[PDB]
Amino acid sequence: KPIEIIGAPFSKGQPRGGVEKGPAALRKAGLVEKLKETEYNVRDHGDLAFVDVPNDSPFQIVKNPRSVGKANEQLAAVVAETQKNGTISVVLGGDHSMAIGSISGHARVHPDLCVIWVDAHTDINTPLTASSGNLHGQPVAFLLKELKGKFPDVPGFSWVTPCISAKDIVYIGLRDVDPGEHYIIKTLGIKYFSMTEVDKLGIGKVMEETFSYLLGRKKRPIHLSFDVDGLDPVFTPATGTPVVGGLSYREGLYITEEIYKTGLLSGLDIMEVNPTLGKTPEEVTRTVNTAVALTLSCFGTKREGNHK
Amino acid sequence: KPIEIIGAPFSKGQPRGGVEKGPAALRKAGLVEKLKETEYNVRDHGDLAFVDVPNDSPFQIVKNPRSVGKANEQLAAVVAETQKNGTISVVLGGDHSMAIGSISGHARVHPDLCVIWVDAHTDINTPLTASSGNLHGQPVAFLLKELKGKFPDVPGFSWVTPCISAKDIVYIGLRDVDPGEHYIIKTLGIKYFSMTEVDKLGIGKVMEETFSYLLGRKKRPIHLSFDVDGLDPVFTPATGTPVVGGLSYREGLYITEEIYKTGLLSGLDIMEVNPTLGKTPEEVTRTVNTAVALTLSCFGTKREGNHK
Amino acid sequence: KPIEIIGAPFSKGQPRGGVEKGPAALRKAGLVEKLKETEYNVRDHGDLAFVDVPNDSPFQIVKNPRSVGKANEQLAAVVAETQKNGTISVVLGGDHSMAIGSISGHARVHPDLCVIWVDAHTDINTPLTASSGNLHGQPVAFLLKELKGKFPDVPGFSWVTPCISAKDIVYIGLRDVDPGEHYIIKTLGIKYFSMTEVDKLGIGKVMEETFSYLLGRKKRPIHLSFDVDGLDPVFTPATGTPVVGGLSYREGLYITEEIYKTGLLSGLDIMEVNPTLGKTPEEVTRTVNTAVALTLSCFGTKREGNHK
Ligand SMILES: [Mn+2]
Ligand SMILES: [Mn+2]
Ligand SMILES: [Mn+2]
Ligand SMILES: [Mn+2]
Ligand SMILES: [Mn+2]
Ligand SMILES: [Mn+2]
């Protein structure tokens, strides 16, 4: 019933910078003002203040493992608190590595939740199969149960508890996956929808199946982790890893409009909005408004109209 | 069998200006020259000359109610004359408020026609539920029978006669509807196809249903009122109310190509082309050529080729 | 199992110039370097050196009939040699008129191959029904059996042997067909998929049918002749005959990804990349990378990932 924006302007997740300005842009985009305008109430948790672990030594390859392990541990702590009160937790953040704290904290109250991860990537690189070391590409690794133990524990993420099985997570939009990640998902029979399947089935049937897969038997809580680079660059240019032939505005919306319809949206995740990475101030607006549009959608803003 | 372009460079419908240049752009785009090249004959009625009602006092909120009531009254007068002769009336115009005279005049000869209103809006705001007062958003209100009487009669539109029921009109492309308009359409069980339904069913099935709904029982005449902002801004940027995630070139065409196939196209409506509103001369070309493409399409120009 | 790039920087096919730089751009785009990175081996045949027939007198209308007849005769000669060794022949070339030597040479080793011609055109103009005389629009004419004899034999193409029936070729993407070409395809009951059919069925079903049509009975070798202007100009602007409302990146790929899946790709054809025709160096990159993406795709580069 209630909503709670938890700013998470973290950044250490990846090399490029400018992702901590995300909650700023979105909020500056009047996000909370339009969201209240829905048949929901909104409590802004305000942005979190992350402590930066000194002499953060790159564990093996993994850059900033402590700082990141920590800033995340803090989010889960906070995400678990608001969820514990029965509120949908929208997390305005920086890089997807902050999905570690989001989900975990969410998973702590509802161990049986499921994940509809929308992104053009899998972010399932273990600190081993990972080329270079930017955690914004390892989330699913720290969370998947079937993966724990298959890589060296990282300094600062021990607090985590693999909380979801491969039968609880579904991917949508994939188009730029690595050899390792591909292996891992294939090896674990994870249900996904690469842009190939979409092009084939049409976003319409993608949801019917994503839903008949995750909510077929039981009807548990849903954790939507929306990565902005999931929608074609023509719509979300202000990101770090833009990939053409992606999801469109109308698709990103059919996805959110459908998640609303279920009535199970428990925890959202709007990540990767990088204002700084806009070739023109316009690109940052196109990204910020369709990031917001998406949010509002998850809360009822249908495209056919909404009367009180 | 014959066609008749009726320029309608009216404008008072909305605030922004530059819509009276539409028939000029379109015609300047060699519209009539390519249209003749079809298996049809074309008679250009030339642009209408609209009298501007002096001291046009904003009735309640409704801006320029007289001037607009009048310019429209004139169109119907003219649209009824050419229709009365058995000719398909293409109306190159300014704002959609000129759809009042178009349909009315059309409806006068064929009371049983039906409407396939393609636009990203509903234009069903009554002079009451309407925020601000630009008639380019009230057409469907002056025409729907079920609505007459539910708002103060406006100075200059009395001549109108609500000529169509909610079972005679279908919407295609909707994406930016108001609370009032949404209420009204929902309250009147009007058949519509928001971008949601499209994304789901795919433009292909949208037509089969729009057709099985309007022409299921009888096979009456069709009045296509094509609003240019119905196609994504990426295609029709030169408009006043651009809304992302709209109909694409290929969709606007499948729509027209299908209407041709029925063989019932009686009266067309190409509205909202605003040359002035192009950030670059290019945007006005992209709008003018795909506005034309659309027209030609309504007349047989299939995408698989056309041999004499 | 093995692949062999055969540069074919020919050009005389059409008026505009800059198509011989295609193999240069593509290769310069690291085409062969990424292609080897597949589960395939690659042998670059290097670019061909075409002799230019002196005093090439425009036979009737057909411009440069000798030069073109010859440069093509050479390709078939070469395409037949590598195919004769059991290698998939990718032909980096200029204008589609070089598809004459490609297919012919291919057809010589496998007379029973079939053609999936992806383009926005039919290239089936006979030296008679053809307006102006640029052979880049007559290929299918020199190859179709049902057409041989219906036009004056051309100086330099006699070596050709119509090698495919209208039941062996399928079209995908059509949107700008002439009166003659339309006639000819209609008159010969050729299976095609104009952008209309795509918009209706969705690229997904287009392949199931293109496949159930050509590979229904027997499962013969496939000859994909990919014309770059088959994908909307927004993706392949660097061509000579750009036509809006075309195939998109995701569609061009679903097409290639599917052809890979069959396992019958015998001979490819990447034509019409014109570096010179890019309004901005960017347009030439957008064209060269999605031309390459396409190639890679035909060889296994799925969008869900590829692990060794
Ligand atoms: Mn991500
Ligand atoms: Mn991503
Ligand atoms: Mn309108
Ligand atoms: Mn509109
Ligand atoms: Mn071609
Ligand atoms: Mn072509």
Per DSSP, helices labelled H in A159-280 are 179-187, 195-201, 203-214, 249-262
Q: Distance between CA atoms of B190 and C62, rounded to whole angstroms?
A: 58
Helix axis angle for C281-298 and C249-262, nearest 10°, is: 20
Let me know: does A209 contact C270? Beta carbons within 8 Å.
Answer: no
Q: Kindly list the distances between the CA atom of residue A212 and the CA atoms of A102, A209, B266, C162, in Å, as whole numbers in the listed order.
A: 25, 5, 45, 52
Ramachandran quadrant class, B55 (left: phi over 0; alpha: psi -120 to 50; beta: rest): left
Q: Give residue C255's Cα distance to chain centre.
A: 14
Question: ∠B233-B237-B242 over CA atoms, to 5°?
Answer: 60
B272 marked as binding residue? yes
Local structure of A267: helix, strand or coil? strand
User: Nearest CB to B182: which of A202, A253, A307?
Assistant: A307
Query: How many A from CA of C222 to the centre of ligand 6?
Result: 20
Are β-strands C270-271 and B169-172 bridged in parallel, bridged antiparallel, or unpaired?
unpaired
Query: Are the Cβ atoms of A254 and B192 closer than 8 angstroms?
Result: no
Q: Tokens for C121, please give them.
A: 């055109």
Cα B294 off chain centre by = 13
* Distance between B169 CA and the closest CA of chain A, angstroms: 16
**Residue (of B234, C46, B40, B87) closest to A232 by Cα position:** B234
Q: For residues C191 and C213, give the distance between their C-alpha atoms in angstroms, rounded to a whole number.
A: 8
**Which among B179, B200, B234 has the least Cβ separation from residue A305?**
B179
Handedness of CA B109, B113, B119, B120 (dihedral sign): positive
Amino acid at A234: V
- Tell me which chain B residue has its CA closest to the CA of residue A37: B179
Structure tokens of A184? 């891992």
Q: Whole-angstrom Cα distance, residue A138 to residue C59? A: 65
Q: Which residues contact B200 (CB under 8 A, 6 or more apart)?
A: A203, A204, A254
* Cα gap A141→A101, rounded to integer Å: 13
Q: Is A121 a catalytic residue?
A: yes
| Strand partners for B225 | B117
Question: What span, in angstroms and rounded, lies between the C-alpha atoms of A223 and A103?
Answer: 7
d(CA C64, CA C156): 9
Name residue C214's amino acid. L
d(CA C138, CA C130): 8
How many CB atoms sit inside 10 A of residue B209's CB?
15
Catalytic machinery residues of C: 96, 119, 121, 123, 136, 227, 229, 272
CB contact (8 A) between residue C305 and residue A196: no
Instruction: Let me know if C108 is exposed, middle or buried by CB neighbors in 10 A (0-12, 13-18, 19+).
Output: middle
| CA atoms of A38 and A23, how far apart (whole Å) | 20
Residue of B nearest to C191 (CA): B304
Compute the Cα dihedral for A189, A195, A196, A199 and give only its sign.
Answer: positive
Catalytic residues of B: 96, 119, 121, 123, 136, 227, 229, 272
Residues in chain C closer than 8 A to B203 (CB atoms): 199-200
Task: Give A-chain residues touching B179 at CB under 8 angstroms.
Answer: 305-308
Alpha helix positions (H), chain B: 22-28, 31-36, 65-83, 99-109, 139-143, 179-187, 195-201, 203-214, 249-262, 281-298
C28 touches chain A (CB under 8 A): no
Q: Among this protein's residues, is A112 annotated catalytic?
A: no
| Cβ <8 Å between B202 and A203 | no
φ, ψ for residue C160 (rounded to 5)?
Answer: -65, 155
Q: Is B269 annotated as a binding residue?
A: no
Alpha-carbon span C99 to C71, nearest angstrom: 11
| Cβ distance of A303 and B192 shorter than 8 Å | no
For residues A51 and B223, what is the distance between their CA atoms, to the nearest angstrom? 65
> Which of A73, A136, A168, A181 is the catalytic position?
A136
d(CA C195, CA C201): 10
CA torsion A276→A281→A283→A288, rounded to 10°?
Answer: 70
Cα A256 to the center of its chain, rounded Å: 13
Instruction: Please tell me the distance from the alpha carbon of residue B178 to that of residue B185, in angstroms, as a whole number.
Output: 11
Angle at C196 between CA C191 and CA C197, to 5 degrees: 45
Residue B220 near residue B112 (C-beta atoms within 8 A): yes
- Asked if A7 contacts A93 with a C-beta cutoff of 8 angstroms, the reply is yes
Please tell me which residue of chain A has the smallest CA distance to C248.
Answer: A245
Beta strands in chain A (DSSP E): 2-7, 41-47, 88-90, 114-118, 169-172, 191-193, 222-227, 265-267, 270-271
DSSP 8-state class, residue A96: G
| CA–CA gap between residue C246 and residue C120 (Å, rounded) | 7
Tokens of B232: 């994504």
Which of C178, C200, C244 minimises the CB distance to B305? C178
DSSP secondary structure string for all residues of A119-139: SSS-----TTT-SS--GGG-H
Q: Which residues of C202-226 are buried (b: 16+ CB within 10 A; e: fewer)?
A: bbbebbeebbeebeeeeebbbbbbb
Counting runs of H as helices and runs of E as strands, what totals does chain C give?
10, 9
Domain residue limits, chain A: 1-308
**For the CA of C97, the nearest ligand:** 5
Q: Are B113 and B223 in contact (CB under 8 A)?
A: yes
Residue B191: closest CA among chain A residues belongs to which residue? A304
Pairing of strands A88-90, A2-7: parallel
Residue C195, φ and ψ in degrees, nearest 5 = -55, -15
Task: Write the CA distances from B4 to B43, B85, C279, integer angstroms.
Answer: 5, 11, 39
Q: Which of B125, B113, B40 is nearest to B264 (CA)?
A: B113
CA distances to A63, A74, A180, B55 from A133, rounded to whole Å, are 5, 22, 14, 71
Q: Which residues contact C261 (CB under 8 A, 6 or more apart)?
A: none
Query: Which of A20, A73, A181, A227 is flagged as catalytic?
Result: A227
The phi and psi torsions of C201 (rounded to 5 degrees) equal -75, -30
Whole-number Å distance between alpha carbons of C297 and C31: 12
Which C positions 107-126 lie with beta carbon below 8 A of chain B?
Answer: 122
Cα C137 to averaged position of ligand 6 atoms, centre (Å): 8
Bridge partners (DSSP) listed for residue A222: A114, A265
A residues 271-290 closer than 8 Å to B (CB): 290
Alpha helices by DSSP H, listed for A129-178, are 139-143
CA-closest candidate to residue B51, choices B65, B69, B71: B71
C122 CA to middle of ligand 6, Å?
Answer: 7
Q: Report the b/e string of C87-102 with b at 16+ CB within 10 A.
A: bbbbbbbbbbbbbbbb
Could you tell me the distance, in angstroms and rounded to a whole number, from the CA of residue A121 to the centre of ligand 2?
5
CA distance C217 to chain A (A): 24
Please choose, from the candidates C171, C186, C63, the residue with its C-alpha nearest in 3D space to the C-alpha of residue C121. C171
* Residue C48 CB-half CA count within 13 A: 27
CATH superfamily of B1-308: Ureohydrolase domain (3.40.800.10)
C294 with C258: CB under 8 angstroms? no
CB contact under 8 A, A186 and C307: yes
Q: Which of residues 151-210 of C touch A (CB under 8 A)?
A: 202-204
The alpha carbon of residue A186 is apart from the nearest alpha carbon of chain B, in Å, by 28
Classify residue A187 by its DSSP letter.
H
- The amino acid that residue B301 corresponds to is T
The DSSP H or E segment spanning C226 is strand C222-227
Ligand nearest to the CA of C96: 5
Measure the CA–CA gap between A51 and A140, rounded to whole angstroms: 24
Q: Which residues, other chains included, contact B82 with Cβ-Cβ below 8 Å and sequence gap of 6+?
A: B4, B6, B43, B45, B89
Whether C160 and C149 have beta carbons less than 8 Å apart is answered as no
Residue C54, judged by CB atoms within 10 A of its CB (0-12, 13-18, 19+), counts as exposed
The pairing of beta strand B265-267 with beta strand B270-271 = unpaired
**Which DSSP symbol is given to C21?**
G
- What is the amino acid identity at position C27? R
Minimal CA–CA distance to C259: which of C213, C306, C222, C225?
A: C222
Ligand closest to A117 (CA) is 1
Does the beta-carbon distance from B303 to C244 stay under 8 Å? Answer: no
Experimental method, per PDB record: X-ray
Nearest by Cα to B250 from B303, B289, B287? B303
Tell me how crowded residue A80 is: count the other CB atoms within 10 A of its CB.
18
Distance of CA B45 to the CA centre of its chain: 18
Residue with tokens 């250009």: B44
Instruction: Quote the ligand 6 centre to C177 CA distance (angstroms).
Output: 10
The torsion angles phi and psi of A105, rounded to 5 degrees, stand at -55, -40
Check the CA dihedral A226-A232-A237-A241 and report its sign.
positive
Q: Cα(C143)–Cα(B198) distance, rounded to whole angstroms?
A: 41
Looking at the complex, report in whole angstroms how far the Cα of residue C284 sits from the nearest Cα belonging to chain A: 16
Pairs of CB atoms within 8 A across A/C: 60
C272 is known to lie in a ligand binding site = yes
DSSP string, C84-145: TTT-EEE-BBSSGGGHHHHHHHHHHH-TT-EEEEESSS-----TTT-SS--GGG-HHHHHBT
Q: What residues of C are in contact with residue A186 (Cβ under 8 Å)? A: 305, 307
Between A180, A196, A245, which is nearest C304 by CB? A196
Q: CA of A305 to nearest chain B CA: how many angstroms apart?
A: 5
Is residue A287 a contact partner of residue A21, using CB atoms and an 8 Å limit? no
CA gap C271, C288 in Å, rounded:
11
A269 has binding-site annotation: no
CB B130 within 8 A of CB B137: yes
Q: Are B293 and B29 in contact (CB under 8 A)?
A: no
Nearest-angstrom CA–CA distance, B155 and B54: 13
Task: For residue A131, count other CB atoms closer than 10 A to its CB.
Answer: 11
Distance C226 CA to ligand 5 centre (A): 8
CA atoms within 13 A on the CB side of C223: 26
C-beta separation of B222 from B210 below 8 A? no
Ligand number with the minimum distance to the CA of A97: 1
C47 is in an annotated binding site: no
Among A109, A123, A72, smallest CA distance to A230 is for A123
